[PDB]
Design a protein around this ligand. Sequence first.
Ligand SMILES: C[C@H](C(=O)N[C@H](C)c1ccccc1)c1ccccc1
Ligand SMILES: [Cl-]
Ligand SMILES: [Cl-]
Length: 318
Amino acid sequence: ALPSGSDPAFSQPKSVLDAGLTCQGASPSSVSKPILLVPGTGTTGPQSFDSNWIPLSAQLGYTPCWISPPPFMLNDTQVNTEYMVNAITTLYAGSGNNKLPVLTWSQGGLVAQWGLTFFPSIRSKVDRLMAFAPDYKGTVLAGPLDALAVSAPSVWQQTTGSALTTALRNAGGLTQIVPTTNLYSATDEICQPQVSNSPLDSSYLFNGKNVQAQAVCGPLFVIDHAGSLTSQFSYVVGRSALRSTTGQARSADYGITDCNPLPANDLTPEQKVAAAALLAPGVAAIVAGPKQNCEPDLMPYARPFAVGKRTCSGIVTP
Ligand SMILES: C[C@H](C(=O)N[C@H](C)c1ccccc1)c1ccccc1
Ligand SMILES: [Cl-]
Ligand SMILES: [Cl-]
């Protein structure tokens, strides 16, 4: 079974977590049809989604809301998760105690599933999860942990073999917790392995709606890590997931004619340009950002699930 009982305490003050949450045109305590957007590594909320799911979710009738954990999602993924959990609590109450969808890119999906795994209170407040290129198993493209160059805290934790991904799995987090759709690509140049269309894939969750784009669009279809978020194909799948009565996208809602890898058709010209360039701010943030030679320690609520792994203060013990 999943962790149960009370939510772990936050390491950050509620006022600090509140400061990282924004909604377009409303206060979080009084917002109509919010959607919470959780960004990828090296970016803010606006940097991940200004060119795609902020205008697209508004056009679908949602008020776009987002978190921007500092610095640019490079800090401890466990802290980035505090921003999300607090945001869901606020937006749920602020919209009349109605569940809301969560839509994520890259690390953002790892953050969402970490939050659902270890903070039980939000399970009843997240209507559904729509994750684009989530790296629940991390990525093996960064190399093994013992050969990793100095890297940001969350980059360590997204490396396959990390204590964080170990703990997520052992606490039960590789199974969906709310109705979840995962859209990913075998041609992902950041997160691998993704080629099997099977539980080996880093984006796969048991009992979830697992959509490898090539399984629908064919082997020559090509979308990269950012294109998994921004493409017109991704929009049709995401639209299906957001509207489905089951909380998961449905194969009947999309098909081979939707297999367009370019930025979503409804985006403005300026937006399409920014969507193609989505990654560049992330790389600049990683050059200027924190770097260390070890993986951040697991917080107490997660430590018992990765006994034996090595973090900055040493080997995790029972
Ligand atoms: C931070 C890095 C990343 O997003 N890097 C950006 C996207 C990038 C793009 C092209 C080449 C190098 C890095 C990362 C690390 C582990 C797991 C997932 C992501
Ligand atoms: Cl398990
Ligand atoms: Cl099922």
